[PDB]
Write a protein that binds this ligand. Structure first.
Ligand SMILES: *C/C=C/c1ccc2c(c1)C(C)(C)c1cc(N(CC)CC)ccc1-2
Length: 133
């Protein structure tokens, strides 16, 4: 349950527009993003992660090592520089993105066949559920 490897198909997506609005994503782009099918592919080898989020139009890929801070430029998202850090809190995978936005990051809970993802920015929380294909 610390093993997030898999191809993950989105099955629920709560308050996605509110989270994108907290990031100041263009209303235009928000309009398109809500309609698109998103696939989350995770390749994990020990502390080494490669995450790829893919849709018809957008692509968001990141690689990181657990417990090692890394500069991130969210080029395909809100286009901001953050100092990111991913750690384990028990079996919860937790990302903090330090920068302009407060309470910015995400958390991942892997429960067997299902992956729960909460994305946070400011006062907004988006809740997603994925099933392993
Ligand atoms: C552990 C999961 C983290 C994470 C990081 C970044 C993104 C996501 C998940 C997605 C799948 C929710 C996602 C989607 C998007 N686009 C729409 C706004 C689509 C590619 C960007 C970034 C992330």
């Amino acid at each position: 349950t610390r093993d997030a490897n898999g191809t993950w198909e989105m099955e629920s997506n709560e308050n996605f527009e509110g989270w994108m609005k907290a990031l100041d994503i263009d209303f235009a782009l928000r309009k398109i993003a809500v309609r698109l099918t998103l696939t989350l592919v995770i390749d994990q080898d020990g502390d080494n992660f490669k995450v790829k989020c893919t849709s018809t139009f957008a692509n968001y890929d990141v690689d990181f090592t657990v417990g090692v801070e890394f500069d991130e430029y969210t080029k395909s998202l809100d286009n901001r520089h953050v100092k990111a850090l991913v750690t384990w809190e028990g079996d919860v995978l937790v990302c903090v993105q330090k920068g302009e936005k407060e309470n910015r990051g995400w958390k991942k809970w892997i429960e067997g066949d299902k992956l729960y993802l909460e994305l946070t920015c400011g006062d907004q929380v988006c809740r997603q559920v994925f099933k392993k294909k």
